[PDB]
Amino acid sequence: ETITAGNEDCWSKRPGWKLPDNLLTKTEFTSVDECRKMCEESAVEPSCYILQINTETNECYRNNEGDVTWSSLQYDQPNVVQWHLHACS
């Protein structure tokens, strides 16, 4: 799945992807829209580009690394989904 608000920001989904907690920063958002909005707008480096959402609590986390350590990835995990920000046309 891939979505966009027609603003050059595209989001793609990765159900079941889970980075470990130490590679994430919990945000104040429990709305995916607001989390994605914050991510697209945050200018603070390390730049936000990966969100991970606890699907039973809706807590949204963002990558805390400038370059995500994907070697620590777990997939086919339950209750979690990631959203990936990609610049697009």
What CATH number did the domain enclosing 83 receive?
Answer: 3.50.4.10
Contact present, 50 and 44 (Cβ < 8 Å)? no
Domain span holding position 42: 1-89
d(CA 42, CA 75): 27
What residues does 2 pair with on adjacent strands?
A: 12
Burial 59-87 (b: 16+ CB within 10 A, else e): ebbbbbeeebeeeeeeeeeeebbbbbbee
Q: How many CB atoms lie within 10 A of CB 54?
A: 15
Integer-rounded Cα radius of gyration of the chain? 12
Beta pairing, strands 24-26 & 9-15: unpaired
> Å resolution of this model?
2.2
d(CA 21, CA 81): 14
Sign (positive or negative) of CA dihedral 18, 69, 34, 60: positive
Number of domains making up the chain: 1
